[PDB]
């Protein structure tokens, strides 16, 4: 059907469509022929390098969705093992799967069958609107496979497609109905939306990055959908005061915030997972305090005996002090040093009233030293020469941190510490008598780094 040529494509596309039509009919219903066709079209939607086959297989699945509801009457839509209910269950099992090419298949299935199931109702409040969480977990499982495999792209696109219709459906149809229980939710008769955002709140600090993001944006689009139509600024203070202080701090701390065996770079993925959890806490705080949702001093400070500040201090004290896993560890530690810089930026530039909780441990030669070391020779802290987003984006987060730092008091260690590395004598002595010659590497690279730092 989806062949390269026009003659054999425009032939055999109507073939497969017409067979989808006929095999979806009460005469061809409950037949091993039809289940064979469905199996074939699935293991075409979930396979390696034939992608032009995945596209057309998604089209075939949306045709299935059309004609299966178009044929099977509601008087018999209770014992069918091939109806849309079981189709969506098999899509879920295809999505919660360790294979980096079956989750992609369920992603494409949703992407093609969202144009339906959203123009249909009276049975759609239990299949998928409830199962946004399951495809969220699909984006969680996509944490490891490959950025360029297109699994995260399609998964984000379908969480997109699903939020853009759940937000509309459940703003008026928001009542204690017997909606089907999705995975991980507490067993209850009603799961309308309050526990949907309560689940989104259970982890905005899950270590897997893109699922965490999507959850955070799902709050920031869903919170103005309760009948109160309120906004997070007062809601987080309300829940923190009516549910205890420990709630909002702990549900962002993670699960494992509590050694020197990895003080030297090591790839033991226990360390990589602690780094991931630190990144999760960093991002969730940054995105909550940073906008007016909560105050910097509201959730930070010693009154609640927090844990972020301790581990971030330990970090900058012990970040920059097998052969190929070193680069992996370096990447995963640089992606979190950059995020703590962004955290300091969103901590200072948001309210210059809480810097007192930023104890002098980072205002010592721990924050500012990694600052200086990114500015000059960023490869010293493991920034691998050869990446794209990180290297081009570094002189942005570094400078924005400097500009958040200048206004605040801790511009003094700033000046007296930059001045120990970009003192004038360094620039003058770098510009020696001969800078044009065979000794390119050392002289030219040193000047390039110092000039780039000075331009920052």
């Amino acid at each position: 059907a989806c062949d390269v040529d026009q003659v054999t494509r425009q032939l055999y596309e109507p073939l497969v469509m017409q067979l989808i039509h006929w095999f979806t009919n009460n005469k061809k219903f409950e037949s091993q022929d039809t289940v064979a066709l469905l199996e074939a079209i699935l293991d075409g939607i979930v396979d390696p390098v034939d992608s032009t086959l995945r596209d057309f297989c998604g089209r075939c699945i949306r045709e299935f969705l059309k004609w299966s509801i178009k044929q099977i009457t509601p008087q018999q839509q209770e014992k069918s093992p091939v109806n849309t209910k079981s189709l969506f269950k098999r899509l879920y099992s295809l999505a919660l799967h360790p294979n980096a090419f079956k989750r992609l298949g369920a992603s494409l299935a949703f992407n093609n069958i969202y144009r339906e199931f959203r123009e249909e109702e009276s049975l759609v409040e239990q299949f998928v609107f409830e199962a946004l969480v399951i495809y969220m977990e699909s984006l969680a499982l996509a944490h490891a496979d490959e950025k360029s495999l297109g699994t995260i792209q399609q998964c984000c696109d379908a969480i997109d497609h699903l939020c853009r219709i759940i937000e509309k459906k459940h703003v008026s149809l928001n009542k204690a109905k017997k909606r089907r229980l999705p995975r991980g939710f507490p067993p209850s008769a009603s799961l309308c939306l309050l526990d949907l955002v309560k689940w989104l709140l259970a982890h905005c600090g899950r270590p897997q990055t893109e699922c965490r993001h999507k959850s955070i944006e799902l709050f920031y689009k869903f919170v103005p959908l309760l009948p109160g139509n309120r906004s997070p600024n007062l809601w987080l203070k309300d829940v923190l005061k009516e549910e205890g202080v420990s709630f909002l701090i702990n549900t962002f701390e993670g699960g494992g915030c509590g050694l020197l065996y990895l003080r030297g770079p090591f790839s033991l993925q226990a360390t990589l997972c602690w780094l991931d959890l630190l990144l999760a806490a960093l991002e969730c705080y940054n995105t909550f305090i940073g906008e007016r949702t909560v105050g910097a001093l509201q959730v930070l400070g010693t009154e609640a005996q927090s844990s972020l500040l301790k581990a971030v201090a330990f970090f900058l004290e012990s970040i920059a002090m097998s052969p190929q896993e070193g680069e992996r560890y370096n990447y995963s530690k640089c992606t979190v040093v950059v995020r703590i810089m962004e955290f300091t930026t969103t901590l200072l530039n948001t309210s210059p009233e809480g810097w007192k909780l930023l104890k002098k441990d980072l205002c010592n030669t721990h924050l500012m030293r990694v600052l200086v070391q990114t500015l000059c020779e960023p490869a010293s802290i493991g920034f691998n020469i050869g990446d794209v987003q990180v290297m081009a984006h570094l002189p942005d987060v570094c400078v924005n941190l400097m500009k958040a730092l200048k206004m605040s008091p801790y511009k003094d260690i700033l000046e007296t510490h930059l001045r120990e590395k970009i003192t004038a004598q360094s620039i003058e002595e770098l510009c020696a008598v001969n800078l044009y010659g065979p000794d390119a590497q050392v002289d030219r690279s040193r000047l390039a780094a110092v000039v780039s730092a000075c331009k920052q």
Binding site: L96, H97, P98, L141, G256, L268
Partner: protein, 1272 residues
């Protein structure tokens, strides 16, 4: 004829157009006309010749079926004979054999009985020219079903000889072209590669005169001539080869002319051998002006030139480079390159070993071309470094010994010798390295020839290399060493007297000026010469160890040698002088570990002689020094010498420990489960460091002994027991720390049905507390273990998780487990276990086996790896003989959400555990069953096929067992690596047959099952076991064989052949499937006899439904066990039943299911002892000694029937009708060769012949277990 098929199909499908049957063939709703299926069919049926062939064939067949209505029988026969004459005209008249045309006529001639007697000679010649042999093979084998049927055999054998398949080729030069007795002898001499006496008694039996028992057929005279040609080709005496090529064609004076060109049989039979012998002789250096003139005069016309130019195309290149017209030799080598291209592209892909043979010539032809190109450079004759790196690459590139027959080595070495002689004469140091290159290359060829048992060619190569092997000291020691190791290797298949005679004479050639002044300079060469000296004396000594007198009875002047290096003190003299030579080798790659093995195996075999001078101390050092390198053979000697130190505990442990400490310890995983066994007993320190180092690099290997052996070992207050127990507990704490491996083990433990575990507990209590109420505190110490899973539903929840089986079982069995806790906790009687029986049957009725889904264990159902807490690493990696990489090993990543409870009594169930390799891996899990037997016999199969891959005879036949990874994670829980796309034999047998006959086989009193039961009951007296012993005194051979044939006649004969011809769609598919099945099953059967694998029901056999190869499974019986313990003995080495036989015919059962057995048995009784002592460690952990003795006997040469007698006498002392047992085991003395053969000293061939004539013996298959199904 290219287009004849499309033409004919067009012509036939024209006349369908102007017929009124075009009424929309279905005219209903899902339509289409009745012509849009015919016109495009023919449109494509003239674009490709395969649809053309196949439409012509199906339409021919349809016409000849629909002519059965009209065309009365006489008219039928007239028409069919017209077709047959036309088809003979097709084959005889065709000019360029178009493979789809030839195959079309040649397989539509196969589907009709009248047309099946086509033309053996034309069939064969057209298959050979068309390179489509399997269609002809099917035709000839269906014509040879239902002299004409001796020239059919000649053509069949002619047509296999091009598809390799040499075993089934030799299987009819001994069963159809036969009936004399020198034929078998010479073919046997050819099979085991002794092509000296084989050709010798081809000549002397071709030169014979009278033989007053019958004149030899011409069909075997021409055979003998061809066989002598091929034999003389193997051991390449090209003198005799050209003489035999000219012998039977014309007179003794060589006239060579168009004599060969007439009567094409002369062409086919003599032209290859003729020019091979002549040109080879021209190549080694001679002129003889013999074949050159014939070739040159043949360079005219069409018939005399086209055949030789198109089908030799490389001998032409060599001859013309000899004539030094480089352009034409080039043209011919390139023409040979496209010749290989077109030939190889035309062998079917399923014709394995035809493409190997065609590919093996590419190396040689490329050598030819690259030399002619290298010599074309004018400056190449002035610069010497081009020669330097050409020699470097040519000594880097060799054919491989053990997988290239000696003709490829011959080709490469001779052609390279000619090339490099041309180079040397084209450039007058260089010539010193030239001579070195020739010498080393010929020595490499000798080594190859020697290590694949082509002894005589190696001897002749030493002889022709001896004249020039005197110029240098190293060349002297090289020649003497090569000849001496030749003698050692070739002195093994011989008789003991022959062995001692032939290895004694390589002693004077060893004490001459080769040990004079050269045992001082090259210490490694000195060590190799010492090894050869020591092994010479070893062979002589260990030879005369057989008998004290008759060995030193037939002897002569040589006896003074025996005297100088009574009659029982010479034993020790040879021993000790060999020991001195061997030790001086030892103090002086693998030469260090070659000395280590020679020393250690001398000591160990002399020990095993003595058990019926500290060798027990001596072996360990060299063993562990070699295990400090890589060695399967040195892997072994922990437990044997640890036992001989359990006898003598004072000496040589700390040296063992010191050497074991310093090694890369990745080499104990293959034996981990044997060394962790001894830690429960004394002297356990022998394996402490290396296990504690494995557990720090490859950390999972302790949980299996030390949750079972720990309570199976009683560690007292001994000064060393406490530290050993704290060592094992400390590794346990340092290995079992994550609670993840134990979590997987508990998930699988709960995956077992609660009913089976309760039944096991009931068996334990009924066998433990019922014998005598003296075993105290056992029930108290074991009840909590089963209560931790059974009883209250919350116990497994505390243990692993909330369990669905305990949810539907612990709740249902509440007031019974309450009673069990109240009374059975301290009852300690087991007097009245009817409560256990009723509880078990209640579990059978309302605790259904169909759990029906994996959700029953949520941890497995919701594994979903989320964090590193010691990820599982699915069990089955870590083979051994590699540096384990647990990062390339597949890690568990999820589970497939379905479980199928495959139906057995104990009922294991099979699970589809996922993996991160994006592939998938299914498994079986057995709960309550110990799997040390299966895992450990599979260890044995791995060592066996490691042996096999290293025997060249077995290797070229690609002889390997099929093994699956068995890994027990504890006693009462193992998993088994279930292979992909397989099926059991039972399902093929009952799925190929028809519904009527499956019904007749299942439900009918006359069926072999019902017939056998009624036979036993009606002429025995009773209905159950023990009737066989009552039978056997009134169950004479004749009546039993007649009844066996009666019952067998019911079940179809061609049934498994129907299976293979049913899933093939090609002749090549059928041919490859049947050959693969027969070969694999032959090695399955003989490897299962080397260590008695009983209980070979039809359901213990798996077979790929993608290759046809066979897999052995479910090794419950591992030694002679069904023949010694079971109430119904199994008096048969292996299943070779009726269907396996009737798979191959017209081929007889002694052509392919014989030669594979022979090569396998040869590879097995050519051992260091690997099988024997790995079996020693098989059985000697908690009469096993007589089991090992029987294995030694029936591996070192023995009669299968006396061995089965030994088994049965060990297991059936004073048993009823034991005389009849032994009489049916031993044979008849007039109908079974088994009986008519001696006790031992049987050769491989004779051993296996007796073995098969015991396996296919109707006197045992008539009386054996009813479920084994001896009729099918």
């Amino acid at each position: 004829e290219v287009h004849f098929l499309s033409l004919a199909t067009n012509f036939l499908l024209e006349m369908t157009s102007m017929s009124p049957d075009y009424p929309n063939p279905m005219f209903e709703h899902p339509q289409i006309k009745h012509s849009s299926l015919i016109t495009p069919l023919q449109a494509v049926a003239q674009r490709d010749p395969i649809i053309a062939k196949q439409l012509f064939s199906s339409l021919f067949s349809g016409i000849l079926k629909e002519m059965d209505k009209f065309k009365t029988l006489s008219e039928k026969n007239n028409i069919t004979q017209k077709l047959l004459q036309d088809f003979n005209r097709f084959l005889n008249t065709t000019f360029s054999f178009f493979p789809p045309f030839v195959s079309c006529i040649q397989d539509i001639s196969c589907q009709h009985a009248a047309l099946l007697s086509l033309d053996p000679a034309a069939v064969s010649a057209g298959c050979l020219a068309s390179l489509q042999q399997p269609v002809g093979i099917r035709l000839l084998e269906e014509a040879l079903l239902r002299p004409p049927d001796v020239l059919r055999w000649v053509e069949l054998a002619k047509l296999y000889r091009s598809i390799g398949e040499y075993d089934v080729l030799r299987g009819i030069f001994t069963s159809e072209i036969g009936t004399k007795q020198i034929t078998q002898s010479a073919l046997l001499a050819e099979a085991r590669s002794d092509y000296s006496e084989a050709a010798k008694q081809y000549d002397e039996a071709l030169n014979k005169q009278d033989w007053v028992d019958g004149e030899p057929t011409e069909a075997e005279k021409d055979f003998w001539e061809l066989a002598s040609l091929d034999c003389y080709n193997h051991l390449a005496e090209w003198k005799s080869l050209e003489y035999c090529s000219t012998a039977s064609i014309d007179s003794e004076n060589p006239p060579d002319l168009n004599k060969i060109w007439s009567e094409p049989f002369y062409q086919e039979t003599y032209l290859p051998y003729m020019i091979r012998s002549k040109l080879k002789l021209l190549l080694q250096g001679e002129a003889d002006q013999s074949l050159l003139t014939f070739i040159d005069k043949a360079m005219h016309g069409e018939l005399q030139k086209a055949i030789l130019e198109l089908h030799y195309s490389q001998e032409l290149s060599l001859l013309y480079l000899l004539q030094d017209d480089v352009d034409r030799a080039k043209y011919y080598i390139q023409n040979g390159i496209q010749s290989f291209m077109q030939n190889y592209s035309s062998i079917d892909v399923l014709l394995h070993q035809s493409r190997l043979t065609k590919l093996q010539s590419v190396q040689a032809l490329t050598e030819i071309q690259e030399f002619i190109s290298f010599i074309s450079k004018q400056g190449n004759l002035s610069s010497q470094v081009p020669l330097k790196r050409l020699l470097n690459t040519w000594t880097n590139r060799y054919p491989d010994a053990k997988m290239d027959p000696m003709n490829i080595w011959d080709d490469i070495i001779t052609n390279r010798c000619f090339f490099l002689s041309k180079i040397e004469e084209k450039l007058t140091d260089i010539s010193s390295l030239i001579r070195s290159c020739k010498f080393s290359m010929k020595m490499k060829m000798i080594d190859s020839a020697r290590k694949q048992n082509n002894f005589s060619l190696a001897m002749k190569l030493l002889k022709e290399l001896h004249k020039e092997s005197k110029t240098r000291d190293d060349w002297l020691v090289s020649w003497v060493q090569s000849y001496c190791r030749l003698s050692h290797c070739r002195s093994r298949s011989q008789g003991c007297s022959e062995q001692v005679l032939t290895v004694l004479k390589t002693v004077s050639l060893l004490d001459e000026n080769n040990v004079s002044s050269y045992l001082s300079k090259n210490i490694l060469a000195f060590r190799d010469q010492n090894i050869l000296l020591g092994t010479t004396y070893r062979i002589i000594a260990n030879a005369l160890s057989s008998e004290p007198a008759c060995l030193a009875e037939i002897e002569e002047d040589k006896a003074r040698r025996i005297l100088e290096l009574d009659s029982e003190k010479v034993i020790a003299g040879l021993y000790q002088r060999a020991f001195q030579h061997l030790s001086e080798a030892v103090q002086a790659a693998a030469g260090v570990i070659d000395a280590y093995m020679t020393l250690a195996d001398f000591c160990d075999q002399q020990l095993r002689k003595e058990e019926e001078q500290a060798y027990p101390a001596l072996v360990v050092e060299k063993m562990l020094k070699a295990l400090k390198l890589n060695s399967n053979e040195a892997r072994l000697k922990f437990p044997r010498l640890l036992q001989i130190i359990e006898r003598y505990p004072e000496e040589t442990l700390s040296l063992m420990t010191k050497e074991i400490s310093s090694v890369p310890c990745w080499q104990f995983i293959s034996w981990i489960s044997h060394m962790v066994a001894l830690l429960d007993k004394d002297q356990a320190v022998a394996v402490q460091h290396s296990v504690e180092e494995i557990t720090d690099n490859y950390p999972q290997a302790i949980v299996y002994p030390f949750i079972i052996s720990s309570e199976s070992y009683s560690f007292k207050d001994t000064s060393t027991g406490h530290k050993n127990k704290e060592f094992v507990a400390r590794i346990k704490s340092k290995l079992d720390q994550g609670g993840v491996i134990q979590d997987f083990i508990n998930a699988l433990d709960q995956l077992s049905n609660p009913e089976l575990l309760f039944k096991d507990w009931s068996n334990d209590v009924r066998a433990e507390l019922a014998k005598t109420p003296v075993n105290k505190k056992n029930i108290e110490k074991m009840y909590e273990r089963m209560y931790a899973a059974l009883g209250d539903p919350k116990a497994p929840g505390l243990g692993a998780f909330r369990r669905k089986f305990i949810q539907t079982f612990g709740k249902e069995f509440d007031k019974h487990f309450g009673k069990g806790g109240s009374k059975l906790l301290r009852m300690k009687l087991s007097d009245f276990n009817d409560i256990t029986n009723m509880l078990l049957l209640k579990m059978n009725k309302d605790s259904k086996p169909p759990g029906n889904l994996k959700e029953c264990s949520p941890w497995m159902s919701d594994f979903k790896v989320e964090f590193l807490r010691n990820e599982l690493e699915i069990p089955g990696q870590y083979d051994g003989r590699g540096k384990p990489l647990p990062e390339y090993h597949v890690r568990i990543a999820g589970f497939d959400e379905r479980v199928t409870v495959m139906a057995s009594l104990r009922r294991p169930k099979r699970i589809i555990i996922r993996g991160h390799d994006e592939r998938e891996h299914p498994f079986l899990v057995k709960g309550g069953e110990d799997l040390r037997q299966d895992q450990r016999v599979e260890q044995l199969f791995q060592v066996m096929n490691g042996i096999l891959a290293q025997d060249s005879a077995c290797s070229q036949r690609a002889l390997q067992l099929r093994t699956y990874s068995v890994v027990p994670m504890t006693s009462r829980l193992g998993l088994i690596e279930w292979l992909e796309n397989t099926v059991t034999l039972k399902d093929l047998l009952l799925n190929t047959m028809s519904q009527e006959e499956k019904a007749a086989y299942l439900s009918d009193p006359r069926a072999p099952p019902c017939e056998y039961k009624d036979w036993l009951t009606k002429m025995s007296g009773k209905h159950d076991v023990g009737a066989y012993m009552l039978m056997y005194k009134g169950a004479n051979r004749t009546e039993t064989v007649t009844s066996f044939r009666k019952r067998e006649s019911k079940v179809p004969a061609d049934l498994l052949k129907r299976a293979f011809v049913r899933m093939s769609t090609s002749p090549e598919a059928f041919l490859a499937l049947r050959s693969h099945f027969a070969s694999s099953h032959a090695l399955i059967c003989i490897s299962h006899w080397i260590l008695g694998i009983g209980d070979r029901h039809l359901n213990n056999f798996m077979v790929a439904m993608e290759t046809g190869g066979v897999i052995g499974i479910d090794f419950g019986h591992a030694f002679g066990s069904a023949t010694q313990f079971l109430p119904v003995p199994e008096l048969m080495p292996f299943r070779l039943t009726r269907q396996f036989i009737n798979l191959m015919l017209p081929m007889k059962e002694t052509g392919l299911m014989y030669s594979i057995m022979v090569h396998a048995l040869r590879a097995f009784r050519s051992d260091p002892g690997l099988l024997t002592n790995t079996m020693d460690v098989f059985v000697k952990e908690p009469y096993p000694r007589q089991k090992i003795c029987y294995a030694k006997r029936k591996l070192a040469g023995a009669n299968p029937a006396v061995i089965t007698c030994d088994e049965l006498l060990l297991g059936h002392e004073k048993a009823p009708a034991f005389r009849d047992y032994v009489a049916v085991a031993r044979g008849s003395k007039d109908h079974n060769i088994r009986a008519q053969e001696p006790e031992s000293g049987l050769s491989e061939e004779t051993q296996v012949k007796c073995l098969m004539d015991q396996a296919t013996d109707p006197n045992i298959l008539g009386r054996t277990w009813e479920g084994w199904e001896p009729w099918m």
